[PDB]
Design an enzyme around this catalytic site. Structure first.
Site, short mmCIF file in Angstrom:
data_model
loop_
_atom_site.label_atom_id
_atom_site.label_comp_id
_atom_site.label_asym_id
_atom_site.label_seq_id
_atom_site.Cartn_x
_atom_site.Cartn_y
_atom_site.Cartn_z
N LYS A 1 52.70 29.76 26.67
CA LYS A 1 53.18 31.06 27.22
C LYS A 1 54.12 30.82 28.44
CE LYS A 1 50.47 33.78 24.28
N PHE B 1 53.12 16.36 29.60
CA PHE B 1 52.61 15.01 30.02
C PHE B 1 51.07 15.03 30.10
CE2 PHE B 1 51.54 12.65 34.10
CZ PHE B 1 51.52 11.38 33.59
N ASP C 1 45.63 13.95 28.04
CA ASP C 1 44.24 14.48 28.15
C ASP C 1 43.61 14.68 26.76
OD1 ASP C 1 44.19 14.66 30.93
OD2 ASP C 1 45.14 16.60 30.92
N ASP D 1 40.12 13.17 25.71
CA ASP D 1 39.02 14.13 25.38
C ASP D 1 38.70 14.12 23.87
OD1 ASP D 1 38.93 14.92 28.09
OD2 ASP D 1 40.25 16.66 27.78
N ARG E 1 45.55 22.13 19.97
CA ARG E 1 46.13 22.60 21.26
C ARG E 1 47.28 23.57 20.95
NH1 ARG E 1 45.22 22.49 26.33
NH2 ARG E 1 44.58 20.32 26.15
N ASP F 1 36.70 14.17 37.03
CA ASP F 1 36.25 14.81 35.76
C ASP F 1 35.57 13.73 34.91
OD1 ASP F 1 36.19 17.58 34.81
OD2 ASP F 1 37.85 17.15 33.37
N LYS G 1 42.26 18.76 39.72
CA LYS G 1 42.60 18.69 38.27
C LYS G 1 43.66 19.74 37.89
CE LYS G 1 41.19 18.63 33.53
NZ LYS G 1 40.46 17.53 32.85
N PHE H 1 41.07 30.56 37.72
CA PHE H 1 41.76 30.29 36.44
C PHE H 1 40.96 29.25 35.65
CE2 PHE H 1 45.10 30.23 33.39
CZ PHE H 1 45.16 28.95 32.90
N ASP I 1 38.98 29.24 32.07
CA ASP I 1 39.35 28.23 31.03
C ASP I 1 38.04 27.60 30.48
OD1 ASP I 1 41.59 26.58 29.67
OD2 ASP I 1 40.81 24.94 30.92
N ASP I 2 37.06 27.33 31.38
CA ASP I 2 35.71 26.79 31.08
C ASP I 2 34.91 27.82 30.27
OD1 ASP I 2 36.58 24.64 32.68
OD2 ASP I 2 34.98 24.91 34.18
C1 LIG Z 1 50.17 29.81 36.70
C2 LIG Z 1 49.67 30.30 35.49
C3 LIG Z 1 49.06 29.44 34.58
C4 LIG Z 1 48.56 29.92 33.36
C5 LIG Z 1 48.65 31.27 33.01
C6 LIG Z 1 48.19 31.73 31.82
C7 LIG Z 1 47.89 33.01 31.47
C8 LIG Z 1 47.48 33.20 30.18
C9 LIG Z 1 47.09 34.34 29.52
N1 LIG Z 1 47.09 35.51 30.20
C10 LIG Z 1 47.01 36.84 29.52
C11 LIG Z 1 45.96 37.77 30.15
C12 LIG Z 1 44.69 37.20 30.06
C13 LIG Z 1 44.03 37.10 28.83
C14 LIG Z 1 42.77 36.52 28.75
C15 LIG Z 1 42.17 36.04 29.91
C16 LIG Z 1 42.84 36.13 31.13
C17 LIG Z 1 44.09 36.71 31.21
P1 LIG Z 1 48.64 37.70 29.61
O1 LIG Z 1 48.30 39.03 30.51
O2 LIG Z 1 49.18 37.99 28.27
O3 LIG Z 1 49.66 36.75 30.46
N2 LIG Z 1 46.70 34.34 28.23
C18 LIG Z 1 46.70 33.15 27.51
N3 LIG Z 1 47.10 31.99 28.19
C19 LIG Z 1 47.47 32.04 29.48
S1 LIG Z 1 47.99 30.80 30.52
C20 LIG Z 1 49.28 32.12 33.93
C21 LIG Z 1 49.78 31.65 35.15
CL1 LIG Z 1 50.57 32.80 36.28
#
Ligand SMILES: Cc1ccc(-c2cc3c(N[C@@H](Cc4ccccc4)P(=O)(O)O)ncnc3s2)cc1Cl
Ligand SMILES: Cc1ccc(-c2cc3c(N[C@@H](Cc4ccccc4)P(=O)(O)O)ncnc3s2)cc1Cl
Ligand SMILES: Cc1ccc(-c2cc3c(N[C@@H](Cc4ccccc4)P(=O)(O)O)ncnc3s2)cc1Cl
Ligand SMILES: Cc1ccc(-c2cc3c(N[C@@H](Cc4ccccc4)P(=O)(O)O)ncnc3s2)cc1Cl
Lengths: 343, 343
Positions: free
Chosen positions: B50, B91, B96, B100, B105, B167, B193, B232, B236-237
């Site tokens: 994204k 990278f 990873d 893992d 992915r 980790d 991490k 965040f 993710d966990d």
């Molecule tokens: C710095 C940074 C790093 C990673 C992200 C990611 C956000 C996001 C997401 N967010 C959705 C919203 C969301 C969905 C499920 C759980 C949490 C948020 P969106 O509103 O469509 O952007 N849905 C899937 N993958 C990802 S990765 C955002 C930021 Cl600003």
């Protein structure tokens, strides 16, 4: 008295200072255990080689810098950058040993084969790379050549990774690869895989530390040092198979691993259609019987004898190049290297 | 209209320019095949996420730089640095995923699982890192913030490698690791991490590109952005196990792989001696039956409910921090992130 043998002890004593400084992250106790792992990785990986890369930085620095300008602090920095080249080497070894499925390196078990390490060694390798730039910052950030060094180390990493990429593309596991084992390819691989970081990097680093950044002056050194790297890697390929592993410190995997070796290239240039088929049926396979058949064909084409004749012509050529291209640098910078890699 | 959704298309169109420029090494045909492999690696690895990291660079740059100072060239550079954060991510993912033992992915097979790749992916990962500094040089070398960026990317790589090290040390394969699954440890891992490179790096990059290098101004942004990274990674966990893999794009390995998960930490803080022993007998093993028993215990301790309550308190806390520490920056820089990671 080799200028290398003399400057060695002082270089190895410095290592403790490198390790003390990279672990003292003393205001960050939360990562204590990680610094412990970093310490283990450096002690296992960056120690037990002949250090010729890093020493070359320190030798060349003594030969290039007016001795009035050799203050205790300026030395520290030369020892450090030297160590920075060693860390670079240790990064590429740890990772290459996983990719090539190596057993041993410098007489002991490969880091990734140690029980409880395995593929975690990928991350360990990455840290060794990280450590370079941590040291360049801690020792050289106020120096005028700081950026020049950072750019030199990264360019050297990119060119080695490009060379590794060619090596891998030329040596697909499971397949018959003899078609792609050409001289043109061979020279390309070793230029990018070995020559830049083993020969150019350390001399170029010292050159910069001595305010010699001239584009033509780096071009001319590079022209000598890349041919030195080509010969060095051809000898590494020769010893991969015909070396003495109480000397080389490592087992040769080039046949089993399907490598575009100098040996296989030379063997291809000389084989009868018949001999081609022995090589075709036996190269690039883990079976000891098939690796033996290849060595027997190499020995039947007196390649060890062809290697001895190339080591002659190469020495003459390299010397003619130091005539042409050493000036304005002391020829001794170059000759000291030649002494170290021709026996 | 999310400021991210709007700036996205222009960001992805730029990718072709990134690839055209990193392959055009046109005066060096000998490495043609290696540039082809580099091209394949970027198309597979740097595409299909994204892009939120890299976009954050480009958004933050628009919010921080006087629009008079937004010339076409200054934009190119923002698109590039954004891409540089994406390459950094690619990278760490590639490598990873080998460590893992990941299957998938972002919806497709992991690069190292593709037939004819395997451990060659280590070298592929290394090239993606290399590409960053190749781009910083090609696009930003004449800029006053050039060194600041090079130092920022390397510091971010070192801290992520330190975090990966914790980790791994906390999650030894084959062993029972529950003793070392503490909150203090958990926070340390995710800080190093994930938080530095996912939150601080992209904002800090934009800040520098806008001549904001103040030590206190980077400290204050960092104080907000690291807590955003903590939340965040906790999410993710959570999604590693309770996510929807048509959304998450990846299979959760944290139980089988023996990870100090937020979930396992929370579960340890709440278990009866009895429940401890269910976890002890079932966590950190490849068997589907034992991973199922763990999910059942988590669900019996209404951890998904505890996660919902933490997502509440975290949002409130994070907002109170943007009150305290956003000035002099537009709060919108921070809020745009919060919008993107709380649903
Ligand atoms: C710095 C940074 C790093 C990673 C992200 C990611 C956000 C996001 C997401 N967010 C959705 C919203 C969301 C969905 C499920 C759980 C949490 C948020 P969106 O509103 O469509 O952007 N849905 C899937 N993958 C990802 S990765 C955002 C930021 Cl600003
Ligand atoms: C750095 C270096 C190290 C070793 C050598 C050697 C050369 C040589 C040799 N050379 C003969 C030629 C030769 C004979 C057999 C096989 C290959 C070459 P020559 O030119 O008649 O002395 N014959 C036997 N043994 C050796 S070892 C040369 C160099 Cl300039
Ligand atoms: C840049 C650079 C990179 C690597 C080296 C190495 C040299 C060398 C070596 N050389 C021995 C001589 C030698 C032995 C066998 C084959 C070739 C040279 P030495 O004379 O004891 O230094 N014996 C084992 N390992 C190595 S690694 C030297 C340099 Cl000036
Ligand atoms: C970003 C974000 C996303 C989702 C939520 C949710 C909160 C909540 C909830 N909260 C109750 C408390 C609660 C109930 C059950 C489980 C956990 C908390 P409340 O405080 O009484 O409204 N009860 C059911 N579903 C939900 S979803 C909150 C935030 Cl700040």
């Amino acid at each position: 008295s080799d200028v290398y043998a003399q400057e060695k002890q002082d270089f190895v004593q410095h290592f403790s200072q490198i390790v003390r400084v990279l672990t003292e992250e003393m205001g960050h106790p939360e990562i204590g255990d990680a610094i412990a792992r970093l310490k283990e990785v450096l002690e296992y990986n960056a120690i037990g080689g002949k250090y010729n890369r890093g020493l070359t930085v320190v030798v060349a620095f003594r030969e290039l810098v007016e001795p009035r300008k050799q203050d205790a602090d300026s030395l520290q920095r030369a020892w450090t950058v030297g160590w920075c080249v060693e860390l670079l080497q240790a990064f590429f070894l740890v990772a290459d040993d996983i990719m090539d499925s190596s057993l041993t390196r410098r007489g002991q078990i490969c880091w990734y084969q140690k029980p409880g390490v395995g593929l975690d060694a990928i991350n360990d390798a990455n840290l060794l790379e990280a450590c370079i730039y941590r040291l360049l910052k801690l020792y050289c950030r106020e120096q005028p050549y700081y950026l020049n060094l950072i750019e030199l180390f990264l360019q050297s990493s990119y060119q080695t990774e490009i060379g590794q990429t060619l090596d891998l593309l030329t040596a697909p596991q499971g397949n018959v690869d003899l078609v792609r084992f050409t001289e043109k390819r061979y020279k390309s691989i070793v230029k990018y895989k070995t020559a830049f970081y083993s020969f150019y990097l350390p001399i170029a680093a010292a050159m910069y530390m001595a305010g010699i950044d001239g584009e033509k002056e780096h071009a001319n050194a590079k022209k000598i040092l890349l041919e030195m790297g080509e010969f060095f890697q051809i000898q590494d390929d020769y010893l991969d198979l015909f070396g003495d592993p109480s000397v080389t410190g490592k087992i040769g995997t080039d046949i089993q691993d399907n490598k575009c070796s100098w040996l296989v290239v030379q063997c291809l240039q000389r084989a009868t259609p018949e001999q081609y088929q022995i090589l075709k049926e036996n190269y690039g396979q883990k079976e000891a019987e098939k690796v033996a058949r290849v060595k027997a064909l190499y020995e039947e084409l007196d390649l060890p004898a062809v290697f001895l004749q190339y080591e002659e012509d190469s020495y003459s050529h390299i010397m003619a190049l130091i005539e042409q291209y050493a000036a304005p640098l002391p020829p001794a910078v170059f000759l000291g290297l030649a002494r170290k890699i021709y026996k």
